Every structure is written in structure tokens, then in C-alpha cells.
Amino acid sequence: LLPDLSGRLLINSVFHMGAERLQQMLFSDSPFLQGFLQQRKFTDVTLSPWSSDSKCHQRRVLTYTIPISNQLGPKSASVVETQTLFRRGCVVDSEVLTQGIPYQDYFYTAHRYCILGLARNKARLRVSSEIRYRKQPWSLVKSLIEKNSWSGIEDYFHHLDRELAKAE
Numbered sequence: 001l002l003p004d005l006s007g008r009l010l011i012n013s014v015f016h017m018g019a020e021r022l023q024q025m026l027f028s029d030s031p032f033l034q035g036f037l038q039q040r041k042f043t044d045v046t047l048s049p050w051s052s053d054s055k056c057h058q059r060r061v062l063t064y065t066i067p068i069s070n071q072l073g074p075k076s077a078s079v080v081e082t083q084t085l086f087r088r089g090c091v092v093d094s095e096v097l098t099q100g101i102p103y104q105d106y107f108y109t110a111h112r113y114c115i116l117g118l119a120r121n122k123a124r125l126r127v128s129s130e131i132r133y134r135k136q137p138w139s140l141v142k143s144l145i146e147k148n149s150w151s152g153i154e155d156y157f158h159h160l161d162r163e164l165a166k167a168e
């Protein structure tokens with residue numbers, strides 16, 4: 001059904017972990033995801049359980065404070081995230097709103113995780129992303145949002161791919 005996003009393909013790896021286990025690791029209050037957000041220096045991390053009243057999907061929300069490295073404005077920011085899980089393995093859509101940064105009103109980002117089982121203890125992981133503009137900033141500003149966002153997005157997910165790798 002649902003395809004990739006018209007932005008970039010961040011992750012496309014095959015792991016020798018079950019789709020169930022891999023799903024448990026990424027989309028729950030797992031010690032993996034805990035030890036990982038700690039590793040990328042995220043503070044004030046707060047998770048919610050998945051909703052239940054819905055029939056075809058579920059929803060949760062996350063929040064956490066992140067460090068900003070790009071010499072532009074604050075040296076930290078808050079991030080409210082919303083995840084919707086569709087069981088099929090599974091797929092989950094993520095809306096990430098970063099607050100407290102420059103030009104926060106201009107844009108937000110979307111990400112899609114695809115988990116497809118392959119064998120008893122083997123599954124694939126795909127992650128595509130895209131940038132979504134509520135309003136169009138002029139050339140100078142937009143180039144900067146594209147540049148800094150994709151650098152922080154790739155740096156995040158590439159490290160996420162490596163940590164799942166060393167997890168066995």
C-alpha cells in the first residue's frame with residue numbers, strides 16, 4: 001500500500017532479528033531505544049503508551065530535548081513527536097516538530113519506518129523522510145533549512161542503523 005517519501009531514503013538494511021523483536025526495539029519503551037537516545041545526548045525523554053481505541057492503527061507521542069551544533073541560535077531545542085503504527089511486520093508514520101529553533105514555524109519533518117519480516121529471525125528495515133513547509137521561505141533561508149535538517153537527519157538515522165547492527 002503506502003510507498004516511500006519524496007525526500008530521501010535514509011535506511012535500507014536487513015537484520016537477522018525478527019520483525020517482532022526489531023519492532024519491539026524501535027517502537028516501545030525498550031532498553032535499546034532508551035540506551036540509544038541517551039547515546040545521542042537526548043534529555044527529558046518522555047514516552048507514552050500506544051493508544052488502543054482505534055481499530056486499524058495505534059498512536060503515541062514522544063518528547064525530548066536535543067542538542068544543536070550548527071552555529072545558529074540556541075544550543076538546544078525541544079522535539080514533540082507523534083507516531084502512528086499500522087500492523088501489516090509493520091509500518092509507522094512519524095511527525096516530528098522541533099520547537100525553540102530558528103524558523104520553526106516555517107517547516108516540520110515526516111518519516112516513515114517500514115518493517116517487513118523475511119524469515120524466523122530475519123527482517124528488513126526501511127526509513128524514508130521528507131521536509132514539509134507550512135510556508136515558503138526565500139532562497140537563502142530555505143537552503144539553510146534543507147542543509148542543516150538533512151545533516152541532522154542523516155547523522156541520526158545512520159547512527160541508528162549502526163546501533164541495530166551491533167545489537168544481535
Ligand SMILES: C[C@H](CCCC(C)(C)O)[C@H]1CC[C@H]2[C@@H]3CC=C4C[C@@H](O)CC[C@]4(C)[C@H]3CC[C@]12C
Nearest residue numbers: 072096098101102109144145148149152153156
Ligand atoms: C535543529 C534541526 C535543524 C535546525 C535548522 C536551523 C535552520 C534552525 O538551523 C532540526 C531540523 C529536522 C530535525 C530532526 C527531524 C527528525 C528527527 C527524528 C527523531 O527521531 C529525533 C530528532 C530528529 C533527528 C530531529 C533533530 C533536529 C532537526 C535535525
